């Protein structure tokens, strides 16, 4: 890897078929700047603060996405039609701040080694699902050309409850729940 | 079957602007095949897939790409990163705990950037033994965190200190425990 | 006159059709 004070990741584009699944992001020092909601065609920032002052124009990347739909078709053929190799994801659950009972916290679920970039991360408390408080970052890039996502979940520290982070992929024959509890 | 194509435009800045390097990788599936390297100065195939491609891109696109370094890297840094990302400074959440020879887990959470220093003290004396630590934890919400243990046995009356140094703090943080 | 953000372009390779 190249050593340096800072690293920009402008232009990071990614396209796949079938399904017309594409993505465009910008990173700085490995922290996602924003992505671009292709359907609404809007520059969706990661953090509010940033996209107030200076701005990014959604078309800059709605175009990249178009070039990558084209480039794909070229290589797909030029490589005798070589499909991608599914790799298995590695989950790592953990609290965002010092866990104290009955104090609003956040439960991060970091998933790594993804490819194809198509993942179904879902949270689960006490063997029954959860849907409230769950944010989820776009696919951030790796140096090895795979990806890592994170699924956040706010909660209240209880030793009664058991959290699992359910991860579903094609490179998995069946889902992978990484268990977590304040008990241990 | 599933097929993928990526593209990464990386801009490396060292000593601020005084040294910039620009890589650019066109990647089928997981296999990088073409690549612009500002150091090299031109496009270079990297697998047999983008063998005749380098000729093309060099033919068609080489000129503009070479300036993308000063027109996209240089610019973004000076004009959009300097006043936003580099400006961001977060103060940490120092909080000493106690294991489940006991252990003084001293958490330090939610900060930015990643530059920091987390020393331990025993009655005003620095300790390097027993003291474990973790690898800088990237939260993703533009904040960090790290847990700095300290295996010890506690005599009544003894004072401890988690000493944290960060750019967001003029005066180093200290947290004590009896 | 608020400066904005640029974003490295990715180019098409020869196709024919």
């Amino acid at each position, epitope marked *: 890897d190249i050593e340096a004070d800072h690293v920009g990741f402008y232009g990071t584009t990614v396209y796949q078929s079938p399904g017309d699944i594409g993505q465009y992001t910008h990173e700085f020092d490995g922290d996602e700047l924003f992505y671009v909601d292709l359907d609404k065609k809007k520059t969706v920032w990661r953090l509010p603060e940033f996209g107030q002052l200076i701005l990014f*124009e959604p*078309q*800059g990347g709605l*175009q990249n996405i*178009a*070039a990558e739909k*084209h480039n794909l078709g070229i290589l797909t053929k030029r490589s005798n039609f070589t499909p991608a190799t599914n790799e298995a994801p590695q989950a790592t659950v953990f609290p965002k701040s010092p866990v104290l009972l009955g104090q609003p916290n956040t439960l991060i679920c970091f998933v790594d080694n993804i490819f194809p970039p198509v993942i179904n991360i879902t949270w689960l408390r006490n063997s029954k699902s959860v849907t409230d408080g769950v944010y989820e970052t776009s696919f951030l890039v790796n140096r090895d050309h795979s990806f890592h996502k994170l699924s956040y979940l706010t909660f209240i520290p209880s030793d009664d409850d058991i959290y699992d982070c359910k991860v579903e992929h094609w490179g998995l024959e069946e889902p992978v729940l990484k268990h977590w509890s304040s008990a241990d | 079957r599933h097929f993928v194509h990526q593209f990464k435009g990386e801009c490396y800045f060292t000593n601020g602007t005084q040294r910039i390097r620009l890589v650019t990788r066109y990647i089928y599936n997981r296999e990088e095949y073409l690549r612009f390297d500002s150091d090299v100065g031109e496009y270079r195939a990297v697998t047999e897939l983008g063998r005749h491609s380098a000729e093309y891109y060099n033919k*068609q*696109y080489l*000129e*503009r*790409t*070479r*300036a*993308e370094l*000063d*027109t*996209a890297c*240089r*610019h973004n840094y000076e*004009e959009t990163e300097v006043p936003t990302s580099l400006r961001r400074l977060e103060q940490p959440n120092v909080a000493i705990s106690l294991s489940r020879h006991n252990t003084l887990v001293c958490s330090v959470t939610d900060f930015y950037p990643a530059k920091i220093k987390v020393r331990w003290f025993r009655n005003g004396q620095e300790e390097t033994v027993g003291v474990s630590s973790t690898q800088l934890i990237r939260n993703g919400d533009w904040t960090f965190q790290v847990l700095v243990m300290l295996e010890m046995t506690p005599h009544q009356g003894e004072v401890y200190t988690c000493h944290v140094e960060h750019p967001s703090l003029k005066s180093p943080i200290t947290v004590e425990w009896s | *006159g608020a*400066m*904005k*953000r*640029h*974003g490295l*372009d990715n*180019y*098409r390779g020869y*196709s*024919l*059709g």
Partner: T-cell receptor
Amino acid sequence: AVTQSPRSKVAVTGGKVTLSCHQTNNHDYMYWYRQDTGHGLRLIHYSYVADSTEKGDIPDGYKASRPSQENFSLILELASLSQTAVYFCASSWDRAGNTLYFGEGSRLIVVE
Amino acid sequence: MPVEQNPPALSLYEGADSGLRCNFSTTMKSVQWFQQNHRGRLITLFYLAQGTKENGRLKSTFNSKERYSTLHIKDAQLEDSGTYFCAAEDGGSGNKLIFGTGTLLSVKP
């Protein structure tokens, strides 16, 4: 290569003028500009994927349309007086320039 | 004002030289110099990404960082009349082409 038509047109105020364009360069981008009283050409619509039009700087009162890859039509539904100008069609691939190639102008004139 | 063409129009005689300034507001990816003849047709003279180029009696330069681009014509001829345009690429707001306000060149005999 890029060829427009009509190469010139005269229209009543309140009529539908429909400028067509057609290129044989297999270029993905196409543009429609307009040239007013010697002060430059100004983008109105572009398009970089069949059946996708994208607004330009002064897209007010025009409707573009990219049916196939070779064709890109500009449409005024209610010809105005202020829409008298010369409309240039240019194309390209990939991102301009060095491979953008312009049309030949289309003098439009609108009378009451 | 994104692009700025100067002068707005100029006079000249045979053989004599002159230059044309083009100052921008932000950093533009590539510039492109044109010239609209008497017919009304746009003819590309230069496409620059950086530095300078030269073509016979013509020569141009481009500096993204210092936000400007010049066009120096040496040994003016008659055929050299007609207006002149520099377009610049945006990259920031889409990558539009932003043309200047033309510069009517008149080459006296």
